[PDB]
Design a protein around this ligand. Structure first.
Ligand SMILES: C=CC(=O)N(CCC)[C@H](C(=O)NCc1ccc2c(c1)OCO2)c1cccc(O)c1
Lengths: 305, 302
């Protein structure tokens, strides 16, 4: 029993984190096989980050201008190369701790674990959602750039996120491990803002299902509804449309508790209009949207890695 | 920027998680050098749950009654003993992945990371606090017993909790790694009294200091308060007494924000009285007590 913001065990990723230094800029890289992945902006001085030409800045730079530290051991670079917004440094040694892994791109609403690192040393781990506006509400200070986000599926680490930069609202922006940014952002010290963020309806519903499975039942009513009727309520309260796809995904939790989804939507509908009337759900006054259906099921079934 | 409940990197603890089996019972164990530590209730049968006699159940066991599994490898048990409520199994292989470590007994209000495990396989990692009533609000299903809580300070892992049981209210009781329970709990399935939970006052104050450091001052006011008058108001909201020691401990965060501790107590007082009128602090619609003064310093600089 119990329900918490649960991160994946970080041991497989801790073994891949290294320090990447270029001039005075230090930040984190991911060392898999003989390649070190990190943000390309490690080749930028404070002057050059205002309006950088990366291909031009990179063409100057040679292998010996990149210091890579894996703990207290030096890795010699023997190849640099750019893919979209990530720098690929080839090194003389394959990482003996390379896990089974893949690069994947997550959708808004999907969650992942972030391993925060400073000077290539992991400091902490936490669970995140890719927001609809493609930002993450992380906790990064200076030197956290190159920190990665990941899911584990059996023995396989799926890397989905590399931290690049902070926005002025205190939220964060980054790429997939193939250097493609999540959201309409660019790697440049500049006036960039997050769009109007929305609430991930399917996640809130999944977390209400987690409440019911943990004995919190006070928000259930006798009333059902329709997707069309519920979505008009969602739109009004800055909630994502709920799709037939989302209803299918909530199928296992709808079966395991005997609450329809349109039933649970009716509950959310009423929670959206009338508020929580001073009560809480899973020790929260606001509706949590950073737990997927899969996250709920995995934690109320106890799958291991 | 940002403020998230941050667990420690679980890697050094993942390397120590093993499976212990005795009869039909299987739970997790902690493999450090040549010793495996687990809840002694692994040796209880289903009719031993109410009034187990551990000395009498243990003397009827030999080494080969304990199956220890470290991944697919079987560890060889060459000795066993009991210390308070943990079973200590001597094995013939020292854990090669043994980090630098110490065992420490924490006080209520202190925070740690839990590695939740099943069959000696880590499932997830989350941060939590020792409540004043010596329970923790964890996430723990059947078979999670022997999961450990810890802090990492440099290279050194401080083990402070091993999970033993769930109480009828859905909160979790466990022992230190010397096998002494936190709170008035015993490894019996008798009716056990989960004492009245209070809010960890010194933690809420730290989290308010953290909100100021991330540039949020909307909850401050122009009042100060005496320690005693603050505590008379706080008890009425089920808040733990704030002591002089708690006040000394907040000194650094006071100095960083230029807000005296008793000025910040004045804020909380007013916060308790008003609620938040549709506002949030560090993303929360209630007052967060699961971050310590030390946790806030580690995660904040502004
Ligand atoms: C009374 C039932 C109960 O305690 N439950 C079931 C849920 C209430 C599990 C539990 O706490 N076992 C710990 C334990 C094992 C053997 C013992 C013992 C205590 O005392 C002596 O012999 C339980 C259930 C779910 C999760 C969990 O962590 C523990």
């Amino acid at each position: 029993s119990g329900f918490r913001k649960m991160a994946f065990p970080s041991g497989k990723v801790e073994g891949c984190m290294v320090q990447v230094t270029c001039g005075t800029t230090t930040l984190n890289g991911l060392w898999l096989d003989d390649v070190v992945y990190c943000p390309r902006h490690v080749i930028c001085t404070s002057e050059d980050m205002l309006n950088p030409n990366y291909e031009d800045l990179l063409i100057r730079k040679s292998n010996h201008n990149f210091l890579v530290q894996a703990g207290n051991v030096q890795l010699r670079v023997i190849g640099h190369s750019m893919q979209n917004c990530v720098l690929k440094l080839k090194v003389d040694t394959a990482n003996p701790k390379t896990p089974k892994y893949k690069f994947v791109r997550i959708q808004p609403g999907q969650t992942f674990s972030v391993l925060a690192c400073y000077n290539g040393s992991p400091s902490g781990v936490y669970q995140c959602a890719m927001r609809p506006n493609f930002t993450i509400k992380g906790s990064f200070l200076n030197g956290s750039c190159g920190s990665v986000g990941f899911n584990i599926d059996y023995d396989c680490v799926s890397f989905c996120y590399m931290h690049h930069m902070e926005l002025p609202t205190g939220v964060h922006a980054g790429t997939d491990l193939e250097g493609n940014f999540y959201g309409p952002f660019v790697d440049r010290q500049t006036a960039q803002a997050a769009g109007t963020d929305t609430t991930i309806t399917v996640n809130v519903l999944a977390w209400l299902y987690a409440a019911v499975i943990n004995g919190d039942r006070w928000f259930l009513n006798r009333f059902t509804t329709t997707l069309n009727d519920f979505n008009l309520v969602a739109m009004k309260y800055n909630y994502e449309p709920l799709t037939q796809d989302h209803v299918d995904i909530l199928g296992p939790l709808s079966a395991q508790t005997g609450i329809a989804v349109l039933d649970m939507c009716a509950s959310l509908k009423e929670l959206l209009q009338n508020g929580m009337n001073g009560r809480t759900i899973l020790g929260s006054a606001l509706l949590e949207d950073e737990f997927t259906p899969f996250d709920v099921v995995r934690q109320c079934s106890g799958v291991t890695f």
